[PDB]
Design a binder for this molecule. Structure first.
Ligand SMILES: [Zn+2]
Ligand SMILES: [Zn+2]
Ligand SMILES: [Zn+2]
Length: 572
């Protein structure tokens, strides 16, 4: 009840009753808020409501102080002062951006731009408000009750009438009824249960609406620059393998936090694990939002770091299969690998946060609250994919607005840049270098002469809204017959429904662009499927074509991106 103002820290008994997070607002700032927004309910120990019996006046601008109580204009005593006067709301201890964050529905991109260009306390208010809004939106969706169980991987669902049906992709994880978390993929549907249970007919599934906790720590700690390496003890005998990053590892010890921009295959995991070999006494906590990103850091550590000093932290509510080679849940080991949402409350000499474009400001703040470190290293690439913003439907979110770290990398530049792509054939490196890296990404490999492009719009069908292009899959089928080496290719597309159709017709393993991020394959077959802003997104395009080590086949819909591909064009 007695707290600090979210805009100027000035201690106050006032909280806005109309804000979903009920932020503490000082006398001067609370006024500026209520007089310029639909928000008029003000809270204290006792709320600002007319005390006269059965009176429903709750608007602070229509209320007054009758000695030590509150009444409206109809019930106030003769000796009464308005609660709103002289730019203040009467309270104990006597913003255009705050108003927009407090009242927006988070469906426009301009809302996310503001949530990242505002002050640090407003980045936290925006992050809790958004996450709480995203949670109440899960309640709007309809329940799915099991109508029939066909086999061990297929079932038929009955949906709730009057309430919308949530998108059926791996992005939406339901909580089954607690018969474990489950996911669905498209009258025959495919059921993927985290726990193996003999699907009961009648058992219902409801979305994982979790409670949004308040944020205390900033998204980024205030930057500190040092004259020498602080609290970290380096080696002189540092393996030749990691010699390329020695100046960069030293920059890490001479700053509180550092940003590393690493385009695809430039050595991000190698840099992250090599930092442990450079400061061999340093206790390092490796974190990322996804289990896949944490597991990819575990695979690199398994090769260079002693296995007895590693531990993979697994939340007691084990969602998916992850890394099994380190001792599980030993928080005290020198090397701790854990997803952000499972981080224990501990300290470290270095905290490494990978896949930084997938972090939200909420995740950035949680890491600063659960981990107190001498150094923080943020690794990722603002030219790769961001975290999905389920509420955002109007506008495109630019990389400088993904999070605070991405904002820094796109404005003031990253502290460190890994400039040599060692994964991709030169045709792919030269294409993305020009597209998203301002020609600063260099190719280590030669041109493979296995990178093809085909301009073919096909026919766009839809499974609700997820798109399908059967003629583009028909072109791939015709190509596979003529190019049997491509039998081992991974099929990639911007749509789950396109992938479902290609899995049956081609038999190739499938991956969406978003689920392919961080992974690499010898051959990639990409079908653009549509000409939407989603399938044309340059960050998504960049991720899609940089998955390939040897060859890529792109069946394109957009002329712009087709013309930019520095690939050999094919006919049909
Ligand atoms: Zn204030
Ligand atoms: Zn408010
Ligand atoms: Zn009244």
């Amino acid at each position: 009840a007695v707290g600090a103002c979210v805009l100027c820290n000035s201690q106050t008994s006032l909280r806005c009753g109309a804000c979903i997070r009920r932020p503490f607002l000082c006398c001067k700032c609370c006024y500026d808020h209520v007089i310029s927004t639909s928000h008029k309910l003000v809270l204290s120990v006792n709320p600002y409501v007319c005390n006269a019996p059965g009176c429903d006046v709750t608007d602070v601008t229509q209320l007054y102080l009758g000695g030590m109580s509150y009444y409206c204009k109809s019930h106030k005593p003769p000796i009464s002062f308005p609660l709103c006067a002289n730019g203040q709301v009467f309270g104990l201890y006597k913003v255009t951006d705050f108003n927009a964050i407090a009242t927006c529905d988070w469906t426009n991109a301009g809302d996310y731009i503001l949530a990242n260009t505002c002050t640090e306390r407003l980045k936290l208010f925006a992050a809790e408000t958004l996450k709480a809004t995203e949670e109440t939106f899960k309640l709007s969706y309809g329940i799915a009750t099991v109508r029939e169980v066909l086999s061990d991987r297929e079932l038929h669902l009955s949906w709730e009438v009057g309430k919308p049906r949530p998108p059926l992709n791996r992005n939406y994880v339901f909580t089954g009824y607690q018969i474990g978390e489950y996911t669905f993929e498209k009258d025959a549907v495919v059921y993927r249960g985290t726990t193996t249970y003999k699907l009961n007919v009648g058992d219902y599934f409801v979305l994982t609406s979790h409670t949004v906790m308040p944020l205390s720590a900033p998204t980024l700690v205030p930057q500190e620059h040092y004259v020498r390496i602080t609290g970290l003890y380096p080696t002189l005998n540092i393996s030749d393998e990691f010699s390329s990053n020695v100046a960069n590892y030293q920059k890490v010890g001479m700053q509180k936090y550092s940003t590393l921009q690493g385009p695809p295959g430039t050595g991000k995991s190698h840099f992250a694990i090599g930092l442990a070999l450079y400061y061999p006494s340093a206790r390092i906590v490796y974190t990322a939002c996804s289990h896949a990103a944490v597991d990819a850091l575990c695979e690199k550590a398994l090769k260079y770091l002693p296995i007895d000093k590693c531990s993979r932290i697994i939340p007691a509510r084990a969602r998916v299969e992850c890394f099994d080679k380190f001792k599980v849940n030993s928080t005290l080991e020198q090397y701790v690998f854990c997803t952000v949402n499972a981080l224990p409350e501990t300290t470290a000499d270095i905290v490494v946060f990978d896949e930084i474009s997938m972090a939200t400001n909420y995740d950035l703040s949680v890491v600063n609250a659960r981990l107190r470190a001498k150094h923080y290293v943020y690794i990722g690439d603002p030219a790769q994919l961001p975290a999905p913003r389920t509420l955002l439907t109007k506008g495109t979110l630019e990389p400088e607005y993904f999070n605070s770290v991405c904002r820094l990398m796109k404005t003031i530049g990253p502290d460190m840049f890994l400039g040599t792509c060692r994964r991709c054939p030169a045709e792919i490196v030269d294409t993305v270098s020009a597209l998203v890296y301002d020609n600063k990404l260099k190719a280590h490999k030669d041109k493979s002469a296995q990178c093809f492009k085909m301009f073919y719009k096909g026919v766009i069908t839809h499974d609700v809204s997820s798109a399908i292009n059967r003629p583009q899959i028909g072109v791939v089928r015709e190509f596979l017959t003529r190019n049997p080496a491509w039998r081992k290719a991974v099929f990639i597309s911007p749509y789950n429904s396109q992938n479902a159709v290609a899995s049956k017709i081609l038999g190739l393993p499938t991956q969406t662009v978003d689920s392919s991020q961080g992974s690499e394959y010898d051959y990639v077959i990409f079908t653009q499927t549509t000409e939407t802003a989603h399938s044309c997104n340059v960050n998504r395009f960049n991720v899609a074509i940089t998955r390939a080590k040897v060859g890529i086949l792109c069946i394109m819909s957009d002329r712009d991106l087709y013309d930019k591909l520095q690939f050999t064009s094919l006919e049909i």
